[PDB]
Design a protein around this nucleic acid. Structure first.
Lengths: 80, 176, 113, 80
RNA sequence: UGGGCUACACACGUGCUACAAUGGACAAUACAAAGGGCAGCGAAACCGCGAGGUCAAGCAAAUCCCAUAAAGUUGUUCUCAGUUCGGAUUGUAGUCUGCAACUCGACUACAUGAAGCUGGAAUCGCUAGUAAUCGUAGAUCAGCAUGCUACGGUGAAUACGUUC
């Protein structure tokens, strides 16, 4: 790489806060908070709302049951 | 190099067993990733292209090449040589870091995400993914994004066929 | 950013929650009380644990893409069954028995003189 | 009527006519002027010639048509 | 029996609601008039967030009920934007009347959240308890009012003058 043209870039820990799932990768975010890695050296941590281990599509988790059919809604509404 | 280690260890073995490769050198690998942003409105406002270049640089980690019009087109009011795009080529460790980040941290941030097109293969083992908004990437703050614009991510692989490319990307972890 | 949609940083937490699709003032208040957070406090001046509790409460409310898809499925069902409501949805006219001789702009678009 | 405590409305004559020949699989077309009759699950797969004002429009009942009125599939006015 | 009178590329009249800070939301707290009620008006209580439901008191009326007026006052909050304005449209879940709310009723809850930033030419009403603004009641009526007819609360500006 050439010198002085590329932005500052360094290893960070992306931390999915929902599942408290850490994984190390490079990025230019430069977040202040530091959390120790399995390796001794700490690196800045990036808080993550969602991730591959927390997304319903990735995990297959079904948040809500499928919509009832018309016959089923008729029956459950009218008690028959 | 977590993704690279996964490729060396698990993906190599899985793919080689699945496709009966007589040698490891036949195992497909991701040759490069080219992230392109076509900014045609740079014709009307160069500051748009400047912002696009800055955002692409933040996303990728390296300065983008500014791509200029190859020919003039009257309808677009485009003159040959006018800068109308940005492009970054990623290889090696930066490529792998960007790929794992795109799979894990970035893609789920897509609004109403339901996986990526499984038919978006050129027919020769290369996959192009069209992201419709830059806000997906964790490195961009929506406050500083004057305009939202997409990107084309071309994963160029050594696979000869869409089937092998699909297997490689799925093992890496691409939704479909 | 809650529910995969960013919410106004300046606004108060409840009013910012309303910006989530499928969230209205009553349900923003219910979410905020279930997850013990003060209404006055702004989202920017909000604890990380408070934000996490808010996300945990919100995730189960069936909002955003899931709600949009459910509504679209209902509309498609009534269109497909060839119902009166379906025909009027297809023709872009008022569905709930309004009068179209006048005052149907919200369904018919701008005036075409 | 509409209120839940009252059962879904349907003309008694229409209901008994539909129930007739229930066992036989050679179900025929039922002429009806009862646009007001509710559609029960019993109607699925049946053909009702529903009066729309001048002629009986044929309507075939499917599962998705449960809960609607027979008039919702027999338009009365003609435009263009 | 069913449909239509409720159609819908459109033009005109009359109105309701708005475009916001003299405002929106939330909390507490005052003050009217004029009317109606027989198988009609329906309190109290309990059930639901609510429309309403359960039973059921009083009353053929200066007695009981419809029926707690609202604007208003005093606080908290928002803080100048298509927004905490606006509430049209649409989905789901209900309540009531009626035999029956698809064509084609009203109302409630959750969710969505369109135009609209004070309106060209032109044009209308009003001289005081008036204009403007806030609610209340009645006829028709099983149900249905932004219409009509009545009631009161707050309550202006201005009239030099008669040439046009």
């Amino acid at each position: 790489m050439k010198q002085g043209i590329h932005p500052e870039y360094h290893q960070v820990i992306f931390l999915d806060t929902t599942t408290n799932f850490k994984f190390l990768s490079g990025s230019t975010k430069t977040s202040s908070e530091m959390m120790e890695w399995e390796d001794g050296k700490e690196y800045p941590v990036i808080r993550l709302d969602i991730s591959s281990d927390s997304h319903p599509f990735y995990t297959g988790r079904q948040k809500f049951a499928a919509a009832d059919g018309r016959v089923e809604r008729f029956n459950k509404k009218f008690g028959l | 190099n977590r993704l690279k280690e996964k490729f060396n260890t698990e993906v190599t073995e899985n793919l080689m067993k699945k496709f009966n490769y007589s040698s490891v050198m036949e195992v497909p690998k991701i040759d490069k990733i080219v992230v392109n942003m076509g900014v045609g409105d740079a014709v009307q406002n160069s500051k748009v292209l400047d912002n696009a270049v800055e955002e692409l640089e933040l996303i990728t980690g390296q300065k983008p090449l500014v791509t200029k019009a190859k020919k003039s087109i009257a309808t677009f009011r485009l003159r040959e040589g006018m800068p109308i795009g940005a492009k970054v080529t990623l290889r090696g460790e930066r490529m792998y870091e960007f790929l794992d980040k795109l799979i894990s941290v970035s893609l789920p941030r897509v609004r109403d995400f339901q996986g990526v097109s499984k038919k978006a293969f050129d027919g020769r083992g290369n996959y192009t993914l069209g992201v419709k908004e830059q806000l997906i990437f964790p490195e961009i703050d929506y406050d500083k994004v004057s305009k939202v614009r997409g990107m084309d991510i071309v994963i160029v692989t050594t696979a000869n066929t869409d089937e092998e490319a699909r297997e490689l990307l799925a093992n890496f972890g691409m939704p479909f | 950013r809650i529910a995969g949609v960013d919410i106004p940083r300046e606004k108060r937490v409840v009013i910012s929650l309303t910006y989530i699709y499928g969230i209205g003032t009553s349900t923003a208040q219910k979410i905020l009380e279930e997850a013990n957070v003060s209404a006055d406090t702004r989202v920017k001046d909000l604890t990380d644990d408070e934000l996490g509790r808010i996300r945990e409460v919100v995730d189960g409310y069936k909002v955003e893409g899931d709600l949009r898809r459910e509504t679209n499925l209902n509309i498609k069902r009534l269109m497909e069954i060839s119902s009166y409501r379906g025909i009027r949805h297809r023709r872009g006219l008022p569905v709930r028995g309004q009068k179209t001789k006048n005052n149907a702009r919200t369904r018919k678009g701008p005036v075409k003189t | 009527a509409r209120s839940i405590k009252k059962g879904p409305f349907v003309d008694e004559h229409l209901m008994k006519k539909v129930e007739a020949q229930e066992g036989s699989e050679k179900k025929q077309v039922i002429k009806t002027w009862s646009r007001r009759s509710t559609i029960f699950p019993n109607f699925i797969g049946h053909t009702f010639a529903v009066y729309d004002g001048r002629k009986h429009v044929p309507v075939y009942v499917t599962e998705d048509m449960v809960g609607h009125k027979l008039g919702e599939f027999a338009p009365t006015r003609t435009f263009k």
